[PDB]
């Protein structure tokens, strides 16, 4: 249940735990939650009301952004990519980034290639939900997906880092999970390797464990676009 | 890196020799300067190939899709870009002196400080362009001063000379090129309210790696004059 304006600050993070400040429908926070689960890290999730934030939350992030990690030593780490990096380095078990410094750099280069997708998927949703023109936004998204399709086809591997899932896949996933409910699943109709990747991801135990309830997510979006503040509670 | 640039019509470089790494650069590019600092700090054996940015070699788009610098090219034909990813790759791939902290939190904190710096490169460029063209600069300078105030707060809170503690580290080298340029850009006045930052500037100038790559002010002044005069020799 989300904490907002009026909520008491949480206590210190206990030794042996790490805390993530999140919101159940935030795709950036979804990234970091995937990495936490995939590495079997003991953690607690504190959800934040993004419309009416707790004033104390600005002591966690100066602009009240999520996700933020808080450690038992009162250290704050943000935002999603830096947090995922930290978790992979700080918790030795099941390394998600590659062993090879070049391959790690390549994954970060792939992440840069992906940089327009979050904005484009969001703008697609807003356009479709507001009845505004979406042809250009979908065309732009299809082009970014073609760039990713070319990588998978060239490599001839199911995932972006090889035959097994790795950090880069989890970093991209949240926006692909959302294509269906956003009404833009048709934007991968020209990219068969990407469609295989989507399925491969759904079969991943960590992805499967964190899959959103589609009906609840639709309910959230409906109240969000009604400007109803209760959408964030 | 005091060599002439390769431009349109030039021939592609051959394979990078075993034991070397190649950086595609330009002598006055601050992003490339960042990566050259890391190469020097770690004593990595390397070759610098300067690219004519006004008149780029056709083959250079096989190194970066949009002809950006810097790009690292390895002896295994691998390409790594741009400056932040290249610097991290260098620090992790090469032994000896390590520039990032070993502690995962301290390393993450350095990445967070880099994010805090993200507006400075564009603001410094915009300030230069405004001053050189005689356009409005009050609000651009105020914006830059605010970004510098954020950095000042970090140094004052930590009570350390450098951004990563009491000695120089990766984060300092990542920020340096734009601070080196304040003088010739004509915006040294934008650190007049930030005394910790002014102390840091001096600490950086005293660093052997920084000092080794420090640009001669007169040559840099000449480059900017040629650049704003639209003289093609600026990029030679
Ligand atoms: Cl599927
Ligand atoms: Cl000085």
Curated annotation (Swiss-Prot), chain A:
Q: Which residues form a coiled coil?
A: none
What Pfam family is a match for this entry? GST_N_3
**Matches recorded under InterPro entries:** Glutathione-S-Trfase_C-like (IPR010987), Glutathione-S-Trfase_C_sf (IPR036282), Glutathione_S-Trfase (IPR040079), Glutathione_S-Trfase_N (IPR004045), GST_omega (IPR005442), GST_Omega/HSP26 (IPR050983), Thioredoxin-like_sf (IPR036249)
E.C. no: 2.5.1.18, 1.8.5.1, 1.20.4.2
Keyword annotations for this protein?
Oxidoreductase, Transferase
Reaction equations catalysed: RX + glutathione = an S-substituted glutathione + a halide anion + H(+); L-dehydroascorbate + 2 glutathione = glutathione disulfide + L-ascorbate; methylarsonate + 2 glutathione + H(+) = methylarsonous acid + glutathione disulfide + H2O
> For this UniProt entry, what's an example GO CC term?
cytoplasm
Q: Does the keyword Transferase apply?
A: yes
GO terms in the biological process aspect are: cellular response to arsenic-containing substance; glutathione metabolic process; L-ascorbic acid metabolic process; xenobiotic metabolic process
Q: Where's the GST N-terminal domain?
A: 16-95
Residues the record lists as binding glutathione: 53, 66, 79-80
Catalytic positions?
Answer: 26
Spell out the protein name for this chain: Glutathione S-transferase omega-2
